[PDB]
Design a protein around this ligand. Sequence first.
Ligand SMILES: OC[C@H]1O[C@@H](O[C@@H]2[C@H](O)[C@@H](O)[C@H](O[C@@H]3[C@H](O)[C@@H](O)[C@H](O)O[C@@H]3CO)O[C@@H]2CO)[C@H](O)[C@@H](O)[C@H]1O
Ligand SMILES: OC[C@H]1O[C@@H](O[C@@H]2[C@H](O)[C@@H](O)[C@H](O)O[C@@H]2CO)[C@H](O)[C@@H](O)[C@H]1O
Ligand SMILES: [Ca+2]
Length: 386
Amino acid sequence: GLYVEKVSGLRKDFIKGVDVSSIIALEESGVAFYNESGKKQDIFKTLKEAGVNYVRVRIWNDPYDANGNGYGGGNNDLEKAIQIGKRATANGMKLLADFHYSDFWADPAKQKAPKAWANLNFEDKKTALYQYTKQSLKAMKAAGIDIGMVQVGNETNGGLAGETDWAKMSQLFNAGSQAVRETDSNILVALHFTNPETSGRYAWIAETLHRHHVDYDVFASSYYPFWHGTLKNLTSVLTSVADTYGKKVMVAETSYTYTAEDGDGHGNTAPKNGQTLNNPVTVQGQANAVRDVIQAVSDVGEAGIGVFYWEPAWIPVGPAHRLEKNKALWETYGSGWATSYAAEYDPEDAGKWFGGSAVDNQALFDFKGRPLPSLHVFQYVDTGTP
Ligand SMILES: OC[C@H]1O[C@@H](O[C@@H]2[C@H](O)[C@@H](O)[C@H](O[C@@H]3[C@H](O)[C@@H](O)[C@H](O)O[C@@H]3CO)O[C@@H]2CO)[C@H](O)[C@@H](O)[C@H]1O
Ligand SMILES: OC[C@H]1O[C@@H](O[C@@H]2[C@H](O)[C@@H](O)[C@H](O)O[C@@H]2CO)[C@H](O)[C@@H](O)[C@H]1O
Ligand SMILES: [Ca+2]
């Protein structure tokens, strides 16, 4: 049934990644994944056959309260990162370590310093950040994980580790970069930003990064069609950065809704009134969207290295009608986007929105763990559907 129009000019080594950080918590919650045939199968093996060649994983310093209760959102710490990294490498896929440098979600509004760095003077925090990055990468190498890229920060549009001054942020960027550089020259260092639709933003950030001598290789951007403007603009701002600063560029996060139904009982992020939905909310629509982001990045030219689909398997732990029975699992295994336990660290957001998955309707797997036909977009962009 599916239809993918061949992406013209797509390079043969283009990165096709997925971020399945929630996978560990979900498997402990009892969630299972299958394959085309319908037999339980490691999701990392299903991803590999689908043509995925990269795995991104978010890493929070200490996503737990004093007693050890996970903040949820996958409770993604270094330990789960190694778990994910091993499976990713055991399935022939490189890893993208995404350091949030925070104990929980880091985005344009949230860049809270880790509890341990809470009150360290700037000099010590910079050292801690370096040490942390250094130690984490080393532990990963020890596990035999094939690290291809490291993200120093996540959507650091306005801050990083409690810091909001770009002069200080840049020093933190270099601190992390420094660790990567010392770990392996071949690892690509990427900085991640979002909101490309914002007039001049990326151009300003790239210039600022340049003026403060930040050493990085990839200028990464998020791209969620329902908020981040046109694909024409995306290609345009990423090409500027590429040409003007000689950096590689890519989309570190992207997805689309394949259905308007909520599968676990926790209101989803999309689709919503006011959101731009240029593709029908269906499996084909979803495939179209992914296919077009890949095209948009590929159109940048030699600088456009790839695209990472964000959370293609954060499916429900149970049907929406079992909301209460679900809340239990989310709270126990942190398999939802956040647990009540995170209120202490982020009372403003997580504090009053904690629960389950907010993106199950954007997975490339159905609510029951079966892969949707859209999952084959990764393969088809090279040839197209016959
Ligand atoms: O559940 C329906 C409601 O969800 C609200 O979203 C909440 C937070 O405001 C939102 O930030 C959070 O998103 C998580 C994280 O903060 C974000 O950086 C990351 O990209 O996604 C995470 C979850 O996918 O999600 C919670 C719960 O959804 C909306 O603000 C509200 O309008 C309504 O949609
Ligand atoms: O899932 C989080 C989502 O946040 C987006 O940023 C929004 C908004 O679009 C911005 O204009 C605003 O400054 O910050 C909020 C988040 O608090 C971001 O663009 C997406 O990529 C995601 O990170
Ligand atoms: Ca949901």
